[PDB]
Ligand binder design. Structure first.
Ligand SMILES: OC[C@H]1O[C@@](CO)(O[C@H]2O[C@H](CO)[C@@H](O)[C@H](O)[C@H]2O)[C@@H](O)[C@@H]1O
Ligand SMILES: OC[C@H]1O[C@@](CO)(O[C@H]2O[C@H](CO)[C@@H](O)[C@H](O)[C@H]2O)[C@@H](O)[C@@H]1O
Ligand SMILES: OC[C@H]1O[C@@](CO)(O[C@H]2O[C@H](CO)[C@@H](O)[C@H](O)[C@H]2O)[C@@H](O)[C@@H]1O
Ligand SMILES: [Mg+2]
Length: 580
DNA sequence: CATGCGAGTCAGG
DNA sequence: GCCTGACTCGTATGA
């Protein structure tokens, strides 16, 4: 039975009630400077559909949109807020976001539309967006009649679902998480995406020309060493050359053929000169295709900026993700790739890039949650945690710690966070499972509190069915009870890791909110550009650097109070590359 | 030929 | 051992 609503030709007073479910539809996946195809409002007075051209041109409606006292309940308010920003319209008063509410209740559901969220509460009087708009090449906005009914049904669902979702969040003790953390953060992410990051395209293009030159040389050297030309970027073709023509040892095979992963190649390097060249070709090719050409494709030609979209409702741990482009995985580990960062510059003359990052936040969080005396003392002394771990595992003085000892202690620390696994550690340290287990055993002997936490958290995950983070984020782990070793083990590691990675996510999100409040109180022009899991990147007038050096680390270090201090390092410079 | 899928790969924390 | 996203190739359908 069709849903009744008024297809309005003009905005009326009853459409501006102080509480309503609001839909400002942007069908385009990437909502930057995208069109708004329709608007729906459901409130105490009824259900309404408004054409965007009329609604967005009406002073009363626009004023209502920007009035913080007029409360709106929506789904993915960031999408609408950013689309409206590109139109010079401010959206305020969003007191409930169904997407974020759904995400907090169960990030595993992968709720990406109103229909999916509504299905969680047995509400199915709304169609999934894909069914209405189609997908990809066939994606398209339907005729007004169909479009109008769909937006109204989504608004109607939101109107009906707010109460039950809020009630469950409250029983989960996640009400403040939604209202005081995720929703306020959504607005901050909206500002960041809209602001964008300036790219020096001329510099990128120049790097691309040089890369193309080097790739050409390595490419030819590879054909020369192989004795024939082939598609180096084809794991299949490369496999034939390496393991058949050149007879290199097959130490690993994928599900469908020979493995040519870098870790595999690294082992074959001693056998033939072609290997080192393939690795070099892989590095340069990655930079060229993904960080030069890929980046250049998404730079807005008019503003010369990239406007990423932070998916705030995707990861199972509470972390954000970044797309079009992904600005959370710009090269930095290898110098040649790190140079890509010289292309990210301040958006204004005489401004500078400022970057602040937490030092070992995950291990500090673990020290706090596990209450491991040794680990807590280590951070209280602000010791080099890898050297310290090496000292305990190997029972040597600081002077006796060799570079390799520290390298292995570092590997154990990087993994201890992801949940112990002799197999996983063995792979990273290229050792036997028996030996890896011995390392783990030694680690636990030195950090008994951590061992206790690992056992206790797995037990809690089994008892309650989920694990939680410092700010009450949760993750259900049904596989924790599986009678399949591998499946159960994966769930156990998630149980061990989620409270760590997740609480670190909670902390930096809170830091972002606290930071913006401080930046506003101080009337600084500085503003956030990016978040990369444990670091914040801002840009600001050079005249604000000294103030930022004191303000940013403090706000980040004081976001939450743990049993150990939080430490933040910072750097600034003319480009993102220089912010080191 | 057209768009779209998985597989394999590798970039980041 | 955890958490992500983008690009290539080669196959899928489909013209
Ligand atoms: O607006 C971001 C928000 O939308 C979802 C769907 O509800 O993702 C859509 O938009 C992303 C950014 O363009 C795309 O990567 C994704 O493919 C598309 O479905 C949510 O996942 C996200 O929180
Ligand atoms: O010149 C392009 C032509 O070369 C082949 C091999 O003969 O592939 C090479 O060039 C591609 C584009 O630069 C790379 O992806 C590939 O790795 C490299 O070997 C052919 O496949 C292609 O038609
Ligand atoms: O040997 C106990 C030890 O094994 C772990 C896995 O590393 O858990 C196993 O044993 C528990 C019973 O003590 C079960 O609840 C669990 O399902 C099973 O995998 C550790 O958590 C535990 O300390
Ligand atoms: Mg750091």
């Amino acid at each position: 039975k069709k849903m009744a609503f008024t297809l309005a030709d003009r905005v009326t007073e009853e459409m501006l009630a102080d509480k309503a479910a609001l839909v400002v539809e942007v069908v385009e996946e990437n909502y930057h400077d995208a069109p708004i195809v329709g608007i729906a409002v459901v409130n105490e007075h009824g259900r309404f559909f408004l054409r965007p051209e009329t609604a967005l041109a009406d002073p009363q409606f626009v004023a209502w949109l920007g009035d913080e006292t007029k409360k709106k309940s929506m789904f993915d308010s960031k999408r609408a807020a950013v689309a409206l920003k590109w139109k010079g319209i401010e959206l305020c008063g969003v007191s409930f976001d169904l997407l974020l509410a759904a995400y907090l209740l169960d990030p595993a559901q992968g709720v990406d539309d109103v229909a999916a969220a509504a299905k969680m509460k047995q509400y199915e009087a709304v169609r999934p967006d894909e069914a209405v708009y189609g997908k990809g090449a066939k994606r398209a906005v339907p005729d007004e009649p169909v479009l109008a009914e769909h937006l109204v049904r989504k608004a109607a669902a939101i109107w009906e679902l707010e109460r039950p979702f809020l009630d469950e969040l409250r029983r989960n003790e996640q009400d403040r998480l939604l209202v005081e953390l995720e929703q306020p953060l959504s607005s901050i992410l909206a500002e960041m995406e809209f602001a964008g990051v300036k790219v020096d395209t001329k510099r990128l293009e120049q790097m691309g020309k040089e890369l193309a030159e080097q790739l050409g040389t390595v490419e030819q050297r590879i054909y020369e060493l192989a004795g024939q030309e082939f598609n180096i970027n084809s794991p299949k073709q490369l496999g034939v050359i390496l393991f058949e023509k050149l007879q290199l040892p097959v130490l690993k095979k994928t599900k469908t053929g020979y493995s040519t992963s870098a870790d595999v190649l690294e082992k074959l390097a001693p056998y033939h000169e072609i290997v080192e060249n393939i690795l070099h070709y892989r590095q340069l090719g990655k930079l060229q295709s993904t960080y030069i050409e890929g980046l250049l494709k998404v730079v807005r030609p008019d503003t010369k900026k990239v406007h990423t979209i932070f998916n705030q409702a995707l990861t199972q741990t509470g972390r954000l993700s970044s797309t079009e482009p992904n600005l959370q995985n710009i090269p930095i580990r290898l110098e040649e790739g790190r140079k890509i960062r010289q292309a990210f510059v301040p958006s204004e003359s005489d401004w500078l890039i400022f970057a602040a990052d937490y030092s070992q936040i995950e291990l500090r969080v673990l020290a706090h949650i596990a209450e491991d005396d040794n680990l807590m003392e280590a951070f209280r002394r602000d010791l080099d945690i890898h050297t310290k771990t090496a000292m305990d595992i190997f029972q040597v003085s600081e002077d006796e710690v060799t570079p390799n000892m520290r390298r292995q202690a570092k590997a154990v620390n990087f993994g201890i966070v992801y949940g112990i696994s002799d197999y996983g550690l063995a792979q990273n340290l290229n050792i036997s499972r028996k030996e890896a287990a011995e390392f783990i055993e030694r680690y636990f002997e030195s950090f008994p509190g951590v061992k206790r936490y690992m056992e206790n958290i797995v037990q809690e995950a089994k008892q309650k069915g989920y694990v939680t983070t410092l700010l009450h984020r949760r993750r259900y782990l049904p596989d924790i009870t599986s009678r399949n070793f591998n499946v159960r083990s994966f769930a156990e590691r998630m149980a061990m890791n989620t409270p760590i990675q997740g609480s670190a996510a909670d902390i930096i999100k809170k830091a972002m909110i606290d930071l913006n409040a401080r930046l506003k109180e101080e009337r600084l022009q500085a503003h956030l550009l990016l978040q990369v899991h444990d670091e914040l990147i801002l840009e600001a007038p050079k005249e604000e650097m000294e103030r930022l050096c004191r303000l940013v680390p403090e706000v980040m270090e004081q976001a939450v109070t743990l049993r150990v201090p939080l430490k933040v390092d910072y750097h600034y410079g003319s480009t993102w590359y220089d912010a080191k």
